[PDB]
Amino acid sequence: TKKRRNGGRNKHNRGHVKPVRCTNCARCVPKDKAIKKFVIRNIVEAAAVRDITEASIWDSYVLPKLYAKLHYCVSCAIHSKVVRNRSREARRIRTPPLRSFPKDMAR
Amino acid sequence: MPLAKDLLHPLPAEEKRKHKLKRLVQHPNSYFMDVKCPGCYRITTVFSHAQGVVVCAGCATILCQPTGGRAKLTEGCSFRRKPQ
Amino acid sequence: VRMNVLADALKCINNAEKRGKRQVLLRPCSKVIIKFLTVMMKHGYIGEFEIVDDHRSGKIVVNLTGRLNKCGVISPRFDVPINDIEKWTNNLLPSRQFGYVVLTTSGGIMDHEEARRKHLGGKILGFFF
Amino acid sequence: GRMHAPGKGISQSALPYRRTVPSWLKLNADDVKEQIKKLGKKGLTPSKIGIILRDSHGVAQVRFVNGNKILRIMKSVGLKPDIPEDLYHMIKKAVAIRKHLERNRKDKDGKFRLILVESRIHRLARYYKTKSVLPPNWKYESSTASALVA
Amino acid sequence: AKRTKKVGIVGKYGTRYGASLRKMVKKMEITQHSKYTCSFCGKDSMKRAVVGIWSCKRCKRTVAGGAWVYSTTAAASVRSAVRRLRETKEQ
Amino acid sequence: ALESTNARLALVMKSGKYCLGYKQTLKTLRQGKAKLVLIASNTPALRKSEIEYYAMLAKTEVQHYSGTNIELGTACGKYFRVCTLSITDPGDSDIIRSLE
Amino acid sequence: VRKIRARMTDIITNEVSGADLKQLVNKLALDSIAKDIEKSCQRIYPLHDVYIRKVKVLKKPRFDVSKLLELHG
RNA sequence: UCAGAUCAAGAGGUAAUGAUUAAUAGAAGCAGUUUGGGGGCAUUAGUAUUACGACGCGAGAGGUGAAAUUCUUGGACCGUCGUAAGACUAACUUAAGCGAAAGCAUUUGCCAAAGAUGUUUUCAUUAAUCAAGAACGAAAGUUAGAGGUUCGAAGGCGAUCAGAUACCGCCCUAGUUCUAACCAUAAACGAUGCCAGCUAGCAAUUGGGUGUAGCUACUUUUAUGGCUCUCUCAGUCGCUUCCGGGAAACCAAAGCUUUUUGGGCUCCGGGGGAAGUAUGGUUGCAAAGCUGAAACUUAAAGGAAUUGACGGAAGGGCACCA
RNA sequence: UGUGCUUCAUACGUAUGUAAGCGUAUUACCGGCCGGUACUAUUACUUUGAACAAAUUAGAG
């Protein structure tokens, strides 16, 4: 049976939409059927940051951030546990939650 | 609401809102401009959603410009909306 | 497109009484369908309706009680003689106590009780009970 | 709606209930006779005469100021077109798709738009040959067509 | 009537040479022997004298053309390209 | 084939007077009767240059049409090819004031 | 978008034809185009941070140190 | 002459002297304002990946579960400026948009077309759906040229493994690329034909219109632009439950299929196999496509859900028979 | 051209369910209200008929 009203995602008024490549897997999965992670990361862990701001000649030199987007195969995002096996009533929730912590995945 | 039953006589600001077509009797949202352009005061009668530019006898410049909906007069058009 | 006005103003009645509204707007009132409601008006089922006269096709704002159960149309308009008028009351109407199948006989638009005494036959125009 | 397209959007004119208004008109009601045809002599199709007189005179609807329509007034003068207007413009479109296709081929979506407009010139021809404003023996042949509309 | 279902102008080589080389030469065997419309006076009179040279029976203009087609597509993409370099390098 | 003179030609082909060809055109241009001479793209350069030398002498303006022989004739309604026409009395068109 | 992209291409091609780089790099050392590419286009859309982001110098005219001594000295 | 009848009346005069509506049907227009990764052709940009040229460096480098194949006649890898070529158009990118569907994303020009909105424009039933027939139809495959970076079926090596014609790793071939043709199939899916009427909430957004001295950029405020709430069309999304329906999963349609019902049109199915086979016909260059049985066999095949089973299923926990 | 009024014939001041009188003329004559009588846009549908074997069937006795 039809497990989702979305199916993948967002395939309405398109017919067929472009694919991207997975990161860990290097698949060719649709752009919309894709776990996407716009990952912002500090370059220097923010725990070895005091070693680096010692060597900063300038005004302690506020650190640049790393920017990427993690297009994921579905079978290779469950495997890396970005997403997991929700309950059938928890399946329906999309926007909640942010609601966790300060800045995650950095650490 | 099982009793919107004054379809016979709705409140005239409600049907003012509705549409030109969706109401009980279709009716235009338009009118006619008896304009008095102060360059020369010969009165020309135009349509509001004009479907045509217009000249005058003396001040024959443009007097009206096309748009999507209501055609915009050229800011020196001392008009008065009237059924005369 | 509208291959019946009589279907697009009798389901529009029937869909608005199962929700229990007190007034239905029908469109666009062929004089076939006015004399269909006039059959239903004089048997109690329909209030005194109002015909808004815009000069395109017409609109009616029909009052109603709530006694109606299923007031539909038969299509296509099968020509029914008098001897096979009861094969269309048996399998259609709930019991022979009440209900009507409306006919367009050669004289006018009438139900199946007035036609079987006046001895007229015609086409089936719809039904209500 | 839209026999050849998906878009079911409704929009039209909403003509009011009152008929003989203008109650303010400057001249005779039937002096639009000598401005239907004086702008009919400038080659204007009656769609363009129905909106050039909305703004100068400015008449609202001709079939209430006079007795009958704009197309009937022009042939009462004698300015009826060689081909009626909703075929004159429907063919000038299908002409222009062919002139675009005699230089820009590889285009299978302007070609598709030609089969649409040609399948409905053949629907207005198939009707105008019944109501007898086009004679019989009148077809859409696309090799003579560009000298009709130009 | 129609005399051949499929060969057209290459029924003259009939049952000779194999079906593909008859099919292949037929594309060239039609455009050569065609009358192209003359691009100098307008008539359907621009026929081929020899390989590569085309001439018009009225107006008396001989042109230099392709082996079978009057103007090749590889040469009209040069006449375009040259005048869009001529537009830049002149003014 | 600009649609601003193709629309104006088809009015002179119903209301106007003209002469549709080269030898009738110089008949008009010698007679001081042409108002406007359209000439084709395709028309040869001597026939071109002596049309303009007559129109210099007869004060008629020459419009250079943007199409061949096959396209002036089509835009004149005709099933033949025109390379020269001289409009001598336009009825409804304002082809006199239409600039290039 | 295409109306401001029209407007961004005409002012900076009035700035670049602008008395060679001793004026021009001094403009981008002030970002003086970025304060006039901003206030002009806000008759079309209120625009965000404008960053000139890249300049290639794909062609170089001549070496000729007579034009370098007032440029370096 | 009456002329039984039958042609035409001295035609200029006496007849309200004759054209229904204009569909919240369609079509076409517009001084219309637009809008959209819609299609075509030119033009043009972006880094990247290669491959080479210089120059510095010094023995490693690719890769992987661990590897090896492989690259270093050291000048590789790496760093760097480069030149050249073919591809692909990121990020912005959405529950946005366009398109008949397949599909569509660097600007800029030109070309033709489209929905929608607006409209006291035009015509007057021109419309609805559809055997036959036509046009388009991802990818792959096929022809004939031009290309030929990346990738890569096939093939050739290295491992792993009892086996490994596989997964994993290396150079690669047809192909991907462009042109001119062919082919006509996809889970071509929303597994949901098209036009039409009705039936409800709630919130967002695409497009257009119209009142907000709502704000608001500044030529001075105004003209505009941006948004604000307030309407309004065509919707599309989203979520909540019907006076809904269904076997359920579930769905504002998949409801109004009442109490065997009825707006119209078209296509398809009748237990499972044998089988989309055989065969004939037709299309095709081929691959193959559109048609399409029976013999025999079979008491079940199947759908949505429930409890256990409690395994490369994630979660949270426990134990010296861990 | 849908009916309205005026009605009266007709179930009980009420009910026309047969009809008659105004919407300028629902077909011209003679007969004693009544007959001969001149004149009928169309088809589908429908009313009652005509017309035609019996046996069967329905079925009366």
Swiss-Prot record, chain A:
Molecular-function GO terms, alphabetical: mRNA binding; structural constituent of ribosome
Record GO biological process: cytoplasmic translation
Primary location class: cytoplasm
Region (Disordered): 86-107
Sorted UniProt keywords: Cytoplasm, Endoplasmic reticulum, Ribonucleoprotein, Ribosomal protein
Subcellular locations according to the entry: Cytoplasm, Cytosol; Cytoplasm; Rough endoplasmic reticulum
GO cellular component: cytoplasmic side of rough endoplasmic reticulum membrane; cytosolic ribosome; cytosolic small ribosomal subunit; ribosome
S-S bridge residues: none
Keyword Iron-sulfur: no
Gene3D superfamilies named among the record's database cross-references: Ribosomal protein S26e (3.30.1740.20)
Keyword Ribonucleoprotein: yes
Pfam family, one: Ribosomal_S26e
Subunit structure: Component of the 40S small ribosomal subunit.
UniProt record similarity statement: Belongs to the eukaryotic ribosomal protein eS26 family.
Protein's name in the database: Small ribosomal subunit protein eS26
Lineage, top ranks: Eukaryota, Metazoa, Ecdysozoa, Arthropoda, Hexapoda
UniProtKB/Swiss-Prot annotation, chain D:
Assigned keywords, A-Z: Cytoplasm, Nucleus, Ribonucleoprotein, Ribosomal protein
A GO cellular-component term linked to this record: small-subunit processome
InterPro entries: Ribosomal_uS15, Ribosomal_uS15_arc_euk, Ribosomal_uS15_N, uS15_NS1_RNA-bd_sf
One Pfam family in the UniProt entry: Ribosomal_S13_N
Cellular localisation: Cytoplasm; Nucleus, Nucleolus
Keyword Transport on entry: no
Domain of life: Eukaryota
Main subcellular location: cytoplasm
Listed GO biological process terms: cytoplasmic translation; ribosomal small subunit biogenesis
Keyword Cytoplasm among UniProt keywords: yes
Family label: Belongs to the universal ribosomal protein uS15 family.
Self-association and partners: Component of the small ribosomal subunit. Part of the small subunit (SSU) processome, composed of more than 70 proteins and the RNA chaperone small nucleolar RNA (snoRNA) U3.
Cross-referenced PANTHER family: RIBOSOMAL PROTEIN S15P/S13E, SMALL RIBOSOMAL SUBUNIT PROTEIN US15
Role: Component of the small ribosomal subunit. The ribosome is a large ribonucleoprotein complex responsible for the synthesis of proteins in the cell. Part of the small subunit (SSU) processome, first precursor of the small eukaryotic ribosomal subunit. During the assembly of the SSU processome in the nucleolus, many ribosome biogenesis factors, an RNA chaperone and ribosomal proteins associate with the nascent pre-rRNA and work in concert to generate RNA folding, modifications, rearrangements and cleavage as well as targeted degradation of pre-ribosomal RNA by the RNA exosome.
NCBIfam families associated with the record: PRK08561.1 (NF006331)
Protein name per the record: Small ribosomal subunit protein uS15
Gene designation: RpS13
UniProtKB/Swiss-Prot annotation, chain E:
Keyword Metal-binding recorded: yes
One annotated GO molecular function: structural constituent of ribosome
Protein name as it appears in the record: Large ribosomal subunit protein eL43
InterPro entries: Ribosomal_eL37/eL43, Ribosomal_eL43, Ribosomal_protein_eL43, Ribosomal_zn-bd
Pfam families, alphabetized: Ribosomal_L37ae
Residue intervals of every C4-type zinc finger in the record: 38-59
Organism: Drosophila melanogaster (Fruit fly)
Family named by the database record: Belongs to the eukaryotic ribosomal protein eL43 family.
Cysteine-cysteine disulfides: none
GO cellular component, one term: cytosolic ribosome
From Swiss-Prot, chain G:
Membrane-crossing segments per the record: none
Location(s), subcellular: Cytoplasm
Traits of the deletion mutant: Flies exhibit disappearance of the follicular cells of the ovary and abnormalities of the associated germline derivatives, leading to failure of egg production.
Tissue specificity of this protein: Ubiquitously expressed in stage 8 embryos. During oogenesis, expression is located basally in somatic follicular epithelium and in the oocyte at the later stages.
Subunit structure: Component of the small ribosomal subunit. Mature ribosomes consist of a small (40S) and a large (60S) subunit. The 40S subunit contains about 33 different proteins and 1 molecule of RNA (18S). The 60S subunit contains about 49 different proteins and 3 molecules of RNA (28S, 5.8S and 5S).
Protein purpose: Essential for oogenesis; required for late follicle cell development.
Name listed for the protein in its UniProt record: Small ribosomal subunit protein eS1
Originating organism: Drosophila melanogaster (Fruit fly)
Primary gene name: RpS3A
Span of the entire protein shown here: 164 to 236 of 268
